Each structure stands twice: as structure tokens, then as C-alpha cells.
Amino acid sequence: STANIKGLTQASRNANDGISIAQTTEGALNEINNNLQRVRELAVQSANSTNSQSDLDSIQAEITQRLNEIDRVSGQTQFNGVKVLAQDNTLTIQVGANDGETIDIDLKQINSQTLGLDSLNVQKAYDVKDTAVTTKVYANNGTTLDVSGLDDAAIKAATGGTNGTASVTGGAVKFDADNNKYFVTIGGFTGADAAKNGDYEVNVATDGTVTLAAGATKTTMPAGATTKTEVQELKDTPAVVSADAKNALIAGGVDATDANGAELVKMSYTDKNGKTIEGGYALKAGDKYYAADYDEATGAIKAKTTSYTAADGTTKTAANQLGGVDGKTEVVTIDGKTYNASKAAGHDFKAQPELAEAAAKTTENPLQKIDAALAQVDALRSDLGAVQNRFNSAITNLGNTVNNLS
């Protein structure tokens, strides 16, 4: 009789834990349901051709936030340490005084993947274009600097000296990039004209022709000066892609030949109506675009890459390609599968072989899919409510049995 009384009484405390498990799980499933209803409403809103890709991009961002919130609740909700929505798990609770007098609680893994929505996407592809990044650098042209005319008579005519035989020292000319100027050193004057020996600015015709202007007077050769033998002229030069940028791409799985011929570009994205907006910078290798940072002031280029632990256990990196459904999403390709860069970061494919792949296209019949998920959640909520009634009825029956024994 004592065994029974103490056993039934403890069995009743056990039943209360079943009820707690059930309420903790229901609470969380209620929150998941709220997030799913918002997702459904957002899908209805996206099914409107008046929406621009910018609009859809905004709706998608919010859908992704809701889905992530669902994965948060699913992964962290707990009762005495049990992650009730994290795995399929049949919990058995003894509700009688003897072995086997139990009620099972069938917990199920409920997350965006098991609900069939981790690839849910309402975006549309942008028309992707690019513009080569250049710089302005002074170069030449076969137009040599002709200073043969600036002879003794010409130098005398411009400076007013008469003593000695003056000449362009070394027949050399110096160039200042800062102001597209030219300079020469004059020597040879003697007597009181010796003071005219020094440096003078000269004018270069849109031809070799170098000349000294009347009234000319020696100045100070501008620092930064440098000898040029042909006419200087500014022409666009493709931004230089560094070895470490190329090597970062290769380390990141980009083909060696393609990476070696990488080109810095500025992205552009045009929508279905024809409107175009500028994107960020990227390294175009082969026919693919890999996101990159670019310091206009320095020319320093930094290839964006994602680090992670491969299935073989080692640490590797993947180049962040511009792709995904919209065409401007940072994705990575690892061992036969494509993932969103942000999701693969820090991931351990050895410890967790499974990671959701990036959406490859716009979702077809999204509402049918969101509705299926809502039905899965309602089905689990119903079952939990019924098992809650079974625990409650057990508590009632245990209470009476104990009453009569005592």
C-alpha cells in the first residue's frame, strides 16, 4: 500500500512534466505559426506584377528574417534542456507506479528545412552588366620632343643674351606631371650673360616642337621633375590587379587561367522596366564575377572570400561569386553545391554535412508550399493538445486512487 501511494504520487509529479513539455512546445509553435502567417501575407503581396525588383528585394529580405527567426526558435527552445523542436524524439514518461505504465510524447524537428521553405524566394533576376575600372596615367606617343630649333639664336632671341654660345644642356627636356609642364637647362652664356645659365619653362606644340617664349627668365626646376623624350599625354589604364588578389581567387577555387586574367570592374544592375543602378566592385574572371573591395586612392584590391571547415576536416576559403536568384547575391560553390556566402561562413561541413543550398530560382506556387508548412505546424499543435489531455486525465485518476488508499 505504501509502495502504491508513494509511487502514484510520484507518477503524478511525472505527469506534470509531460504537461510542461507540451506547453513549452505549443508556446514555441505558436510563435512559429505567427512567423509563417507573416510569410504567407508577404508571398501574397509579392504576387503583384506592379512590384519592381527593388520591391521584391525588400519583401525577400523580410521573408528571410522570418525564416531565420523560425530557425532560432526551433534550435533554442527548451524545457529542462530538451530542445523540443530540434529533433524527432519520442519522450516516454511513466505515469503509473509500475514499469511500462507510460504515455509517449512524439516531438518532431520543425524548422525551415523540414517545413520545406529554406529555398522560398520571390525575387527575380537583374540584367547584369559591368564597366571596366580605369585610371588616368601620362604616357607618350611616337611624337618625340623636337628641341633642335631652340638653338643659340633662338635662346638669345628669347632671353636677350649675346655673350657666348648658349644651348639646351644635353638637349634634354624635363616633365612635371602635376601641371603638364616642360623644362630645360640652358648653358653656355658667358660674361654678364652667365647669369642666364639655368632652368627655363618651355612650350611644346601639339607636335615635337619645343620653344622658349619671349621675355623668358630662369626659374627653379620643379621637384618631381623627370626627363621625358616624347610628348606626354594622359590615357586610361586598366586598374592593376595584384598578385595577392589573383592568388586569393585561386585559393578560393577559381580557375587558374581565368583568375590570372582577372579584370577589375564596376557592376551595374538593370531591372525589368529598364532602370539601372550601379553595384559594387568585382573581379571578372572568365565569365564570372567575384565580389571585391577597392581603394580608389591606393588601387589596393581585396577579393572577398568565405572561410569554413571542409568535409575532409581542413580549413579552406571560397571566393564570393555574384549570383543567386537576383544576380547580385554573394554565393560560394563548395564540393558540388552552391550556398549563400553569409550562411557558409564558419560552417563545418565535417560536423554538419547538411547546410541549406542557395535558392536557384524564383519559387513556383509559393502559397501552396507555405500552406503545406502551416498544416504541418497545426497538426503537431493538435497532437500535443491531445497528449496534454491524456496527462491531465492520468493526474485525475491518480489523485482518486491515492485518495481511496489513504
Residue numbers in the entry: 54 to 459
What does the paper say about this structure?
The long external filament of bacterial flagella is composed of several thousand copies of a single protein, flagellin. Many S. enterica serovars express one of two distinct flagellins, FliC or FljB, in a process called flagellar phase variation. We show that both flagellins of Salmonella enterica serovar Typhimurium, FliC and FljB, are methylated at surface-exposed lysine residues by FliB. Lysine methylation increases the surface hydrophobicity of flagellin, and enhances flagella-dependent adhesion of Salmonella to phosphatidylcholine vesicles and epithelial cells.
However, while the structure of FliC has been determined previously, the structure of FljB remained unknown. In order to map the identified ɛ-N-methyl-lysine residues to the structure of both flagellins, we determined the crystal structure of FljB. The tertiary structure of FljB resembles, similar to FliC, a boomerang-shape with one arm formed by the D1 domain and the other formed by D2 and D318. Interestingly, the methylated lysine residues are primarily located in the surface-exposed D2 and D3 domains of both flagellins. Notably,  except for two lysines in FliC and three in FljB, the detected lysine residues were methylated only in the presence of the methylase FliB and most of the lysines conserved between both flagellins were methylated. Further, we found that a single flagellin molecule can contain up to 16 (FliC) or 18 (FljB) surface-exposed methylation sites. We note that the preferential methylation of surface-exposed lysine residues suggests that the methylation of lysines depends on some structural feature of flagellin and might occur only after flagellin has at least partially been folded. Deleting the D3 domain also removes the majority of methylated lysines and, interestingly, FliC∆D3 and FljB∆D3 strongly affected invasion of MODE-K epithelial cells.
